Structure formats: C-alpha cells, structure tokens
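> forwarded from #structure-qc
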C-alpha cells in the first residue's frame, strides 16, 4: 500500500539566438548613476496598471535573479514608490531604469534609458522587466 507518485519533468531552456546577456558589471554609485541619468534622455517610458498588492522585496530579489542591480528603491507602503535599476549587456552598453508607482493610483511608470540605444537591446531589456513584474503580479506561471 501507499501510492507513491514521483512526477518527472526534466525541462531545458536553451539560450536565445539574439543573445542579450545582461550582467550587473559595474555597480554604479548614487553620484555616478545621477550624472549618467541626467547625461541620457528617456529612450522608452511604459505606463502599466499594477495588478493587486505590491511587493518591493519580491520585485528586487527577482531582479537580482535576472542580473539587474538595484541602485535605489523605496519601501513597502511608501508612495510615490520609486526605484532605480541598472544593468550592462555583454557588448558594453550601459542601461539605466526607473520604476515609479503613483501616490493614490496603482499605476507603475517604467522609464528606461541606455547609453548606446539599440532597438533589439531596448525591447529585450524591457521583456526581462515584463517577465519579472508580471510573474510577481500574477502567481502561477
């Protein structure tokens, strides 16, 4: 007796053809990030209605899993919740990101500005952000 069930599910995700490998590389100081942010202009800005309860701890830790370094971040319950992220791809382009969560409104505005802007790098970088944010708004996938 005792019905034992060992569910075997051996997946394997192969690296993408257009291989954008985002490394943290240089941890940018508050001073350096500030200067470089003001030195660049917002390349993309995306407005998204945040789904349900917000968790900055969960968001930050998932960003770390996808090699996105956290420059600055506000606390849970604190609005306007703003955070500054950075990354750098394997081809040496520097990425600067902002996350803004409105005072009374459940609206998150993502402001991305990289130094040498490619259409591919910008789209793929945001796609990483979409996956991180979405998986924390809706818990299943």
């Amino acid at each position: 007796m005792g019905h034992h069930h060992h569910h075997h599910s051996h997946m394997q995700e192969l690296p993408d053809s257009g291989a954008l490998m985002l490394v943290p590389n240089r941890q940018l100081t508050a001073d350096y990030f500030e200067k470089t942010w003001l030195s660049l202009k917002v390349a993309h800005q995306q407005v998204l209605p945040w789904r349900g309860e917000f968790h900055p701890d969960t968001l930050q830790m998932a960003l770390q899993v996808v090699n996105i370094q956290t420059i600055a971040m506000s606390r849970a319950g604190s609005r306007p919740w703003k955070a500054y992220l950075s990354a750098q791809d394997d081809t040496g382009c520097l990425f600067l990101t902002e996350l803004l969560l409105e005072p009374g409104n459940s609206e998150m505005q993502i402001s991305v500005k990289q130094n040498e802007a490619r259409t591919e790098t910008l789209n793929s970088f945001i796609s990483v952000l979409e996956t991180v944010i979405g998986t924390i708004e809706e818990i299943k996938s």
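QC bot note: The domain at 1-141 is CATH 3.30.310.10 (TATA-Binding Protein). The chain is about 30% helix and 25% strand.
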